[PDB]
Curated annotation (Swiss-Prot), chain B:
Interacts directly with pre-mRNA. According to PubMed:2251118, associated with spliceosomes prior to and throughout step 1 of the splicing reaction. According to PubMed:8943336, it leaves the spliceosome before reaction 1. Interacts with SPP2. Residues 19-185 form the Helicase ATP-binding domain. GO terms for biological process: generation of catalytic spliceosome for first transesterification step; snoRNA splicing. A motif (DEAH box) lies at residues 132-135. Its EC number is 3.6.4.13. Involved in pre-mRNA splicing. Is required together with ATP and at least one other factor, for the first cleavage-ligation reaction. Functions as a molecular motor in the activation of the precatalytic spliceosome for the first transesterification reaction of pre-mRNA splicing by hydrolyzing ATP to cause the activation of the spliceosome without the occurrence of splicing. Capable of hydrolyzing nucleoside triphosphates in the presence of single-stranded RNAs such as poly(U). This is Pre-mRNA-splicing factor ATP-dependent RNA helicase-like protein PRP2. Keywords: Acetylation, ATP-binding, Hydrolase, mRNA processing, mRNA splicing, Nucleotide-binding, Nucleus. The gene is PRP2. It comes from the Eukaryota. The chain holds residues 215 to 867 of 876 of the full protein. Residues 210-384 form the Helicase C-terminal domain. ATP binds at G32, E33, T34, G35, S36, G37, K38, T39. Signal peptide: none annotated. Belongs to the DEAD box helicase family. DEAH subfamily.
Swiss-Prot record, chain D:
It comes from Saccharomyces cerevisiae (strain ATCC 204508 / S288c) (Baker's yeast). Present with 752 molecules/cell in log phase SD medium. It comes from the Eukaryota. Transmembrane segments: none annotated. Belongs to the SPP2 family. Belongs to the CWC complex (or CEF1-associated complex), a spliceosome sub-complex reminiscent of a late-stage spliceosome composed of the U2, U5 and U6 snRNAs and at least BUD13, BUD31, BRR2, CDC40, CEF1, CLF1, CUS1, CWC2, CWC15, CWC21, CWC22, CWC23, CWC24, CWC25, CWC27, ECM2, HSH155, IST3, ISY1, LEA1, MSL1, NTC20, PRP8, PRP9, PRP11, PRP19, PRP21, PRP22, PRP45, PRP46, SLU7, SMB1, SMD1, SMD2, SMD3, SMX2, SMX3, SNT309, SNU114, SPP2, SYF1, SYF2, RSE1 and YJU2. Interacts with PRP2. Involved in pre-mRNA splicing; specifically in the final stages of spliceosome maturation. Promotes the first step of splicing. It is found in: Cytoplasm; Nucleus. This is Pre-mRNA-splicing factor SPP2.
Length: 45, 653, 121, 51
């Protein structure tokens, strides 16, 4: 989420599917958006 | 007389010790100043002693400059009182003036004596080779002392001699395993060296300031030679001087400005040699051409900002880069010596004595670490050198510089995949051109999709050696008057020479179209020599069949010439990308290169609006201020890339 | 030789190119040279109409050429953002909405350079 | 694993041929020939000081 963050596109639902598919772990869409707001907070990377 | 004046020279009084020193040792190193007489007088003394004697062997004197080899051999014709061509010769690239049995001492240049290895490796004709000006460190000189280190076990009777500058001569003796250094300290008219006490901000202004400090106050007759970096900082100093010369009053005497550099035309380079008349002062601006090449009479005062301009071949991407650097202490002391040519002279240096000791370097750059090594690896491999890292050379090329030259011979087909030099690779040693250029001539004859066009590829290849010094002024002004349909920078060269030929080689035609006539003489001499060596290999005979047996004289000619220059130059192709043109190599990525302002592809992309061709072949990737491209060639069809060089482009396309 | 025949021609090309999508760039390639010599030479009603014709052709082009012309198109649009003319404003909007879909134009270049001036005009 | 080419030390080959490049690629020839031998901008105007 952070490494690509500086030049990201508008579609968060396609990025939500790429992470969920290349890792083979199924996440609820409402559960994933909790962490997207947690990752929006993080300052140093 | 002349015999009376030879005793005046410094090396003559050291002669009687010097002969026993040569007869005892094998390799001797002479540490002498410029003007000591070690060039002229030394091989004369061996003939007077009877060195060559009854024997067939003759002395060779090697100099780096072709112009200096002819001019020194005129002096020895005067001193030994024999006409030039017999008993005193010179053998240079174009004007062999020798007798094969009556000429004793021949003053050939440095590139010549490497070529005699290619036929005869042991040098059976020579008893005493004297390298001269070995501190120049040309590419031909470093290989020549690298190969003559191996020949000394095979011949114990050959004498070798080296004339060198002072600071460089220590490093030579350790290379030849501590052979003795002889010394002749002959110096004429010493120079007083003036400094600035504090570092300056903008040296061009302080240069203009210091000329007026010499002009308004100092004694006459006095001339000024300044050393600017390149062309572009001479015209800016030429223009800013012309304003202030007029604005100053009518009482001050006239000042003349006469720029010199290599690419400036011959008609203006003769203006320095004219003696300036009374009541006027000659100021000369110059690049490096003043310090070593030629002699301007009357130069008392020399202003030296201390900057040279040098090119470092970056071997990964394969590009030269040409930057401004602070020059070494060796080249500064050569610049001050141009002052004391006639009488005592001043030398003004725009820097401090603290910076001159602690910031500047001793030796500038060995030229073999700089330049491209694709030509000499094939020279070494044909002389049976199996091991190149362990080759006993003075200053090693870096391993990427030496790796890139081994892939580049493998692409062209010179080296077999087992490492053996092939049939084609033996020809490239013979031709007097690069290994890239001699494959262009080879697919111009034999290759089945490019036959018959060898009569035109000799014309272009001859023109590409002289592309800096063709046009007087801007190119497109001279390009448009010749013809108006050229879309590539190569086909203009085929057309300018063909119309200069049908004008029966006129001098007056060149001044009509703003082309340097002296350069076109040199292109004609290069063309005739490439035509001899293509007869002698036999490419001319296989050429002429493919025009008679297959008639092709239409507009397919300029599509076969394009096909030949891909097989010769296959790493040099770019591709049109989003920013601009990008280099198409597999190891080197896109460098976002831009067409140079001189080229015909720059006129057609800005002054007109031709849509850019998707691939462009270039001849030279250099970066002065930006990664540029020179001598471009439009490739229209993409499938010419796969068909001509499939060993690279079957992958990348 | 007349200018209002030259302007009505360029509006017709932008109509034909938009009804043709995604096809036909072989046909439309022969007109790209006179449109860019009109864009660099001119101002006003010829500039805004020639730019509109070129802007509708960008979608029919191939990636390599679509990125090269879009880069040339964005320098004119940034030079001409202040313009009060309705005919030029309507061309800026057409070029923005086509050149958004080109992969050369990054999301970060739009946020720093283009979008703070789009929303204030 | 690694490719190593040694030179013959002292009748001619017309061309490299398509097959040869397939075995030894063009990138591989630069390393392998060495390994067989045993490898394993200044501003516009200033003085030489001019801080």
């Amino acid at each position: 989420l952070k490494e690509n963050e500086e030049n990201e596109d508008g579609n968060i639902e396609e990025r939500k599917e790429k992470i969920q598919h290349e890792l083979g772990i199924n996440i609820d869409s409402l559960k994933f958006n909790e962490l997207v707001k947690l990752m929006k907070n993080i300052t140093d990377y | 007389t002349i015999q009376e004046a030879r005793k005046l020279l410094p090396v003559h009084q050291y002669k009687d010790e010097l002969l026993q020193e040569i007869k005892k040792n094998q390799v001797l190193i002479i540490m002498g100043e410029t003007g000591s007489g070690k060039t002229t007088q030394l091989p004369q003394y061996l003939v007077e002693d009877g060195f060559t004697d009854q024997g067939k062997l003759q002395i060779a004197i090697t100099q780096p400059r072709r112009v200096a080899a002819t001019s020194v051999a005129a002096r020895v014709a005067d001193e030994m009182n024999v006409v030039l061509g017999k008993e005193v010769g010179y053998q240079i690239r174009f004007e062999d003036k020798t007798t094969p049995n009556k000429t004793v001492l021949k003053y050939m240049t440095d590139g010549m004596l490497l070529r005699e290895f290619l036929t005869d490796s042991k040098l059976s004709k020579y008893s005493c080779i004297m390298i001269d000006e070995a501190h120049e460190r040309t590419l031909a000189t470093d290989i020549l002392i690298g190969l003559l280190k191996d020949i000394l076990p095979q011949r114990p009777t050959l004498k070798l001699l080296i004339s060198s500058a002072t600071m460089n001569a220590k490093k030579f003796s350790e290379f030849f395993d501590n052979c003795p250094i002889f010394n002749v300290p002959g110096r004429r008219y010493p120079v007083d060296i003036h400094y600035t006490l504090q570092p300056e901000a903008n040296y061009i202004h302080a240069a203009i300031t210091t000329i007026f400090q010499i002009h308004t106050t100092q004694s006459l007759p006095g001339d000024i030679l300044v050393f600017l970096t390149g062309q572009e900082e001479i015209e800016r100093t030429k223009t800013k001087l012309e304003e202030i010369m007029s604005k100053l009053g009518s009482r001050t005497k006239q000042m003349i400005i006469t720029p010199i550099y290599a690419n400036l035309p011959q008609e203006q380079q003769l203006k320095i040699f004219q003696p300036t008349p009374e009541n006027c002062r000659k100021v000369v601006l110059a690049t490096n051409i003043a310090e070593t090449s030629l002699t301007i009479d009357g130069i008392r005062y020399v202003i030296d900002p201390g900057f040279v301009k040098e090119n470092s071949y970056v071997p990964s991407t394969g590009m030269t880069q040409l930057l401004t650097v602070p020059c070494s202490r060796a080249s500064v002391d050569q610049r001050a010596g141009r002052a004391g040519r006639v009488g005592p002279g001043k030398c003004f240096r725009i820097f401090t004595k603290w910076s001159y000791l602690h910031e500047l370097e001793l030796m500038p750059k060995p030229e073999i670490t700089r330049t491209n090594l694709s030509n000499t690896v094939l020279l070494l491999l044909s002389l049976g050198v199996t091991d190149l890292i362990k080759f006993p050379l003075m200053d090693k090329p870096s391993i990427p510089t030496l790796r890139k030259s081994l892939e580049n011979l493998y692409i062209l087909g010179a080296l077999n995949s087992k490492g053996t030099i092939t049939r084609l690779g033996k020809m490239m040693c013979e031709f007097p051109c690069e290994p890239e250029f001699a494959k262009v001539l080879y697919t111009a004859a034999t290759h089945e999709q490019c036959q018959g066009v060898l009569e035109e590829c000799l014309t272009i290849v001859s023109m590409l050696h002289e592309t800096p010094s063709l046009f007087i002024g801007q190119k497109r002004d001279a390009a448009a008057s010749v013809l108006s349909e050229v879309e590539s920078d190569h086909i203009l060269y085929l057309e300018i020479f063909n119309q200069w030929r049908n004008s029966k080689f006129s001098r007056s035609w060149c001044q009509d179209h703003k082309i340097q006539f002296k350069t076109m003489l040199r292109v004609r001499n290069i063309r005739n020599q490439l035509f001899r060596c293509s007869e002698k290999v036999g490419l001319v005979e296989k050429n002429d069949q493919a025009r008679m047996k297959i008639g092709n004289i239409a507009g397919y000619i300029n599509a076969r010439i394009t096909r030949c220059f891909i097989s010769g130059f296959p790493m040099n192709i770019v591709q049109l990308g989003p920013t601009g043109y990008q280099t198409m190599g597999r190891s080197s990525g896109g460098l976002n290169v831009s067409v140079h302002p001189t080229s015909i592809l720059f006129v057609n992309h800005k002054e007109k609006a031709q849509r850019p061709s998707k691939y462009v072949l270039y001849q030279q990737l250099m970066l002065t201020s930006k990664e540029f491209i020179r001598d471009c060639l439009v490739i229209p069809k993409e499938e010419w890339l796969i068909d001509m060089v499939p060993q690279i482009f079957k992958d990348l396309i | 030789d007349h200018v209002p025949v030259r302007i009505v021609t360029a509006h017709t090309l932008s109509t034909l190119a938009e009804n043709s999508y995604p096809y036909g760039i072989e046909v439309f390639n022969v007109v790209l040279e006179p449109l860019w010599k009109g864009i660099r030479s001119h101002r006003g009603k010829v500039l805004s109409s020639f730019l509109k014709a070129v802007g509708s052709m960008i979608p029919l082009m191939d990636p390599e050429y679509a990125g090269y012309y879009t880069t040339e198109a964005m320098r004119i649009i940034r030079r001409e953002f202040d313009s009060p003319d309705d005919e030029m404003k309507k061309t800026i909007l057409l070029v923005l909405q086509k050149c958004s879909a080109v992969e050369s134009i990054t999301p970060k270049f739009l946020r720093e350079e283009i979008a703070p001036e789009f929303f204030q005009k | 694993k690694k490719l190593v080419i040694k030179l013959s030390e002292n009748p001619l080959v017309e061309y490299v041929t398509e097959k040869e490049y397939n075995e030894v690629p063009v990138e591989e020839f630069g390393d392998a020939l060495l390994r067989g031998m045993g490898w394993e901008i200044h501003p516009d105007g200033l003085g030489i000081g001019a801080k």
